[PDB]
Amino acid sequence: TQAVEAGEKTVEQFVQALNKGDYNKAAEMTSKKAANKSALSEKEILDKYQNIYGAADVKGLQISNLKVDKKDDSTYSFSYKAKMNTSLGELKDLSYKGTLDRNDGQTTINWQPNLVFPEMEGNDKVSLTTQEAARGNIIDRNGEPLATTGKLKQLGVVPSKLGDGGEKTANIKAIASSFDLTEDAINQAISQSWVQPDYFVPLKIIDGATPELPAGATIQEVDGRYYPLGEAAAQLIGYVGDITAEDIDKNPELSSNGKIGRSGLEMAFDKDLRGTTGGKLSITDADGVEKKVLIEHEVQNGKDIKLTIDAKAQKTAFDSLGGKAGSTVATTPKTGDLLALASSPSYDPNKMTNGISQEDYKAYEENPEQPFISRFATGYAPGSTFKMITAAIGLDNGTIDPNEVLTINGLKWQKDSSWGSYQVTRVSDVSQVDLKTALIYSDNIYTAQETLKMGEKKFRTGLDKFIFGEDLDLPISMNPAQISNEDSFNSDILLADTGYGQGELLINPIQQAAMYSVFANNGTLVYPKLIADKETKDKKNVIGETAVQTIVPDLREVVQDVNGTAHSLSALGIPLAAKTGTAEIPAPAPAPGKENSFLFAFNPDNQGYMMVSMLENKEDDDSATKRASELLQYLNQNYQ
Numbered sequence: 322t323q324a325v326e327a328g329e330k331t332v333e334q335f336v337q338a339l340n341k342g343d344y345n346k347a348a349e350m351t352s353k354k355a356a357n358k359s360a361l362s363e364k365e366i367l368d369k370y371q372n373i374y375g376a377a378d379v380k381g382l383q384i385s386n387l388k389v390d391k392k393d394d395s396t397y398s399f400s401y402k403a404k405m406n407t408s409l410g411e412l413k414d415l416s417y418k419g420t421l422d423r424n425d426g427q428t429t430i431n432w433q434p435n436l437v438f439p440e441m442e443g444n445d446k447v448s449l450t451t452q453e454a455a456r457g458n459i460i461d462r463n464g465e466p467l468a469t470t471g472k473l474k475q476l477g478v479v480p481s482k483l484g485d486g487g488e489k490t491a492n493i494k495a496i497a498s499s500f501d502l503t504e505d506a507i508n509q510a511i512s513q514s515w516v517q518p519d520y521f522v523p524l525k526i527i528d529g530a531t532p533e534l535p536a537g538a539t540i541q542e543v544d545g546r547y548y549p550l551g552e553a554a555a556q557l558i559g560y561v562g563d564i565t566a567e568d569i570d571k572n573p574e575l576s577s578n579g580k581i582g583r584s585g586l587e588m589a590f591d592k593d594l595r596g597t598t599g600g601k602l603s604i605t606d607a608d609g610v611e612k613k614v615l616i617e618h619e620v621q622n623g624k625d626i627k628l629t630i631d632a633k634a635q636k637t638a639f640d641s642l643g644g645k646a647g648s649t650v651a652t653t654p655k656t657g658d659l660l661a662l663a664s665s666p667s668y669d670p671n672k673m674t675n676g677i678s679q680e681d682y683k684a685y686e687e688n689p690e691q692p693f694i695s696r697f698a699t700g701y702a703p704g705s706t707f708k709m710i711t712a713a714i715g716l717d718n719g720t721i722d723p724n725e726v727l728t729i730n731g732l733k734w735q736k737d738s739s740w741g742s743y744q745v746t747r748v749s750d751v752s753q754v755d756l757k758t759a760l761i762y763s764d765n766i767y768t769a770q771e772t773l774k775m776g777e778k779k780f781r782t783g784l785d786k787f788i789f790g791e792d793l794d795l796p797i798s799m800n801p802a803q804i805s806n807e808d809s810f811n812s813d814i815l816l817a818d819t820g821y822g823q824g825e826l827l828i829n830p831i832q833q834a835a836m837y838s839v840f841a842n843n844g845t846l847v848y849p850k851l852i853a854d855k856e857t858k859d860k861k862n863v864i865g866e867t868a869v870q871t872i873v874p875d876l877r878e879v880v881q882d883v884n885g886t887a888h889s890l891s892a893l894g895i896p897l898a899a900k901t902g903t904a905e906i907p908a909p910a911p912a913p914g915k916e917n918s919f920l921f922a923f924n925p926d927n928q929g930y931m932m933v934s935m936l937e938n939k940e941d942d943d944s945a946t947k948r949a950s951e952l953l954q955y956l957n958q959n960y961q
């Protein structure tokens with residue numbers, strides 16, 4: 322019975338070729354054209370599958386429940402069931418028939434129409450009508466639009482209504498001087514390869530008032546994706562682009578005429594936002610008369626998505642960065658609601674999703690400050706803000722006495738002579754330094770000595786209670802925060818640097834706002850939350866409640882004391898508990914070192930808001946504390 326063994330392989334070899342998209346190789350393992358064999362030629366079957374399976378974007382043909390027999394001398398009948406994925410979802414429970422033929426020694430298939438779809442017969446045709454689904458909206462915690470689809474005023478020119486010569490050059494200089502467009506770019510689009518003398522060539526997108534129209538300038542209304550806050554949330558929201566042929570080859574349930582998320586939340590939530598395509602896939606007669614319907618369902622528009630983001634806080638946080646490199650994260654620390662996730666510099670998502678030049682796109686990628694980076698998801702060394710956690714660990718294990726006063730002389734210190742030339746450095750030469758004094762002046766030497774006194778085992782014991790190595794349940798690509806490169810410092814120097822927020826620490830701004838939430842929840846860490854409806858998740862007993870009641874009053878003095886590093890914030894007249902930081906980054910080539918300014922601040926009275934702002938590669942005299950007054954006033958007013 323070794324004949325049925327070769328027959329099951331012939332059917333298996335045929336389905337694989339169809340599944341692999343190679344229709345020619347599938348057509349070669351069929352029999353010759355005859356009434357008792359195949360119904361079409363090899364090149365005729367190739368065009369049959371390519372036209373039909375291609376029009377429906379058939380992908381992932383897989384079979385099951387195969388049964389091969391032997392009816393006559395060389396007529397071995399076979400049957401199975403199959404399923405496939407098309408533009409309108411999955412087509413399951415398909416009953417296929419057909420027969421085989423094993424003359425000579427090879428088992429060829431007697432091809433028939435019913436090997437394309439179960440009920441195909443002779444010269445039956447296939448039709449596919451689809452209704453595209455509208456993309457869902459992205460909204461803030463109060464329903465404000467962050468990413469919607471709407472009507473736009475598109476500026477464009479037609480070469481015929483421009484004129485002939487001289488008069489045509491004058492309007493090109495007139496259209497360029499009325500819509501903020503380059504005079505050398507109007508002809509760059511008029512003289513493209515696709516242009517004809519009467520076509521409507523697009524130009525710029527008017528995002529407000531429609532000015533006067535020179536000779537040969539029409540504004541047509543076309544619908545497209547629109548981002549109200551613009552660059553203020555471009556990294557977080559992202560942008561959508563035209564769907565390509567390879568996008569369909571990867572997921573046929575898309576829409577060749579639709580838009581797909583290319584970055585940010587538009588890409589992370591692409592499935593829930595794009596919806597599902599409607600329409601029907603049916604088999605018709607030889608004359609086009611509908612015979613059998615294969616797939617059909619209504620068009621379902623995309624779901625809206627409500628974020629915890631405050632649209633007003635998002636814009637204020639971004640604008641406060643003045644276009645400099647940095648990022649700001651604002652939360653309601655008791656719940657974890659991410660109120661703002663700003664990153665600067667940024668790109669224009671409206672220009673990105675509508676029409677953008679290869680020149681402006683190259684300016685974004687070749688910009689050294691890298692406007693495409695989501696800096697709120699980029700790991701940094703936390704700097705001196707991390708002293709709050711090193712101190713709280715020292716209070717939890719009894720290593721740090723808040724009233725114990727260390728005697729530090731000078732601006733440099735080392736454990737012993739084995740450290741060589743390296744020394745911990747502080748900025749203020751305060752002789753008598755206790756915990757409160759250390760947090761006010763941000764004393765690295767106090768922090769380094771208390772860290773070395775604590776020891777690595779006790780230090781990591783307190784550190785592991787946080788979220789180092791954890792993957793936050795957020796729709797944002799990020800790497801987990803890390804304490805060091807390996808599970809052991811293996812260096813007293815690296816142990817000290819980690820104490821005051823340097824060393825090999827890597828914590829992104831979002832993870833910092835999560836780790837620092839303990840000081841607004843009596844030692845309970847509250848995980849951040851971006852989706853409004855999602856349930857609040859927390860982590861009990863990260864630090865002791867005694868340490869919180871000890872450090873938070875000291876953090877008030879970082880603002881209120883005359884020599885506090887955040888004393889400029891006392892001008893606000895609002896209850897503030899803050900901690901500043903300026904992390905130093907080593908330079909590759911012999912170049913001046915780069916510095917990163919940091920600011921942590923929250924309301925110690927009502928715990929209504931908490932923020933963590935930073936500047937990457939800060940300019941001189943620039944800082945995050947310098948720019949925080951406006952956002953702090955808003956968060957204190959609206960989030961209590």
Ligand SMILES: *C(=O)[C@@H](NC(=O)Cc1ccccc1)[C@@H]1N[C@@H](C(=O)O)C(C)(C)S1
Pocket residue numbers: 704705706746747748762763764765821822886900901902903904905916
């Ligand atoms: C924490 O970040 C500490 N920073 C340093 O020791 C590095 C440094 C950077 C610039 C100048 C001098 C030293 C301390 N905290 C910051 C801060 O709170 O801004 C200080 C500049 C006070 S030093």
